[PDB]
Amino acid sequence: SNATVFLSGSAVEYNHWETEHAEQFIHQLSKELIRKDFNIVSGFGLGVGSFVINGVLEELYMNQGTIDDDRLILRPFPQGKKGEEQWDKYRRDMITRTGVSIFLYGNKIDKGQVVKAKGVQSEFNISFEQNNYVVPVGATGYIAKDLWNKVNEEFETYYPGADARMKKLFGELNNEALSIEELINTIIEFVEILSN
């Protein structure tokens, strides 16, 4: 049954979408996950985490709810050298309660240049190591695209025994022509199948 997902991602740019449009996508994806009775773990990634929070708080507070209901589990990363020493252990810890991991975007500024986000790759590896189903949203580009290609290349390793609907939905995760609503509905239906 629908349980807890890890929502992985970071961004300073959003492939073919303007920032405000990608923010709406992340906000509405997070809201729809809540409305479908999922819980979310988020590491508050730059360019992503704030909009996850925004979508969840909209749904909670329209219902006089509370962040203490643990629909959204927040694990912001400690910044600086001491913090970085714990990031691997912290990731392995925070992913434990999740069973499905979703990957979005994955890019950051390093030395004044936009580069791929290795932390999203690390979260993919950790997720797979505990036998989570992984959901790389290739249409969002960057690491998520690399991960989508990796999974596509060894599909039966990641989704053994998948049915035709799963295969179609997986392909649509990489369809850059889909609207926000169409891409969200693809992700949600795929994650529901993987949770059931």
Minimum Å distance from CB 177 to ligand OJC? Answer: 25
When asked if residue 97 is in the footprint of its own copies (CB under 8 A), the reply is: yes
Shortest CA distance to 95 belongs to which of 116, 118, 59, 119? 119
Nearest distance from residue 52's CB to its own copies, in Å?
8
Looking up tokens 């609503």, which residue turns up? 181
> Please, which of residues 23-52 interact with its own copies by CB under 8 A?
23, 27, 44, 49-51
> Minimum CB separation from ligand OJC for residue 13, in Å?
12
- Distance from C-alpha of 134 to C-alpha of 115, rounded to nearest angstrom: 22
Among 86, 149, 157, 175, binds its own copies (CB under 8 A): 86
Task: Give the closest residue to 176 by CA, choosing from 133, 128, 151, 144.
Answer: 144
| Binding to its own copies, residues 51-80 (CB under 8 A) | 51, 53-54, 57-58, 61, 66-68, 74-80
- Candidates 71, 95, 99, 123: give the one binding ligand OJC (CB under 6 A): 123
Q: From residue 1 to residue 30, what is the string marking binding to ligand OJC with x (rule CB under 6 A)?
A: -------xxx--------------------
- CB neighbour list of residue 172: distance below 8 Å, 6 or more residues apart: 178, 182, 183, 186
Selection from ligand OJC, its own copies, none that 89 binds (CB < 5 to 8 A by kind) is its own copies
Contact 185, 170 (CB under 8 A): no
83 is a contact residue toward its own copies (CB under 8 A) = yes
| Residue in the structure block whose two tokens are 């349980």 | 3
List interacting residues with ligand OJC (CB under 6 A): 8-10, 43-46, 76-77, 79, 87, 108, 117-120, 123
List interacting residues with its own copies (CB under 8 A): 23, 27, 44, 49-51, 53-54, 57-58, 61, 66-68, 74-80, 82-83, 86, 89-90, 93-94, 96-97
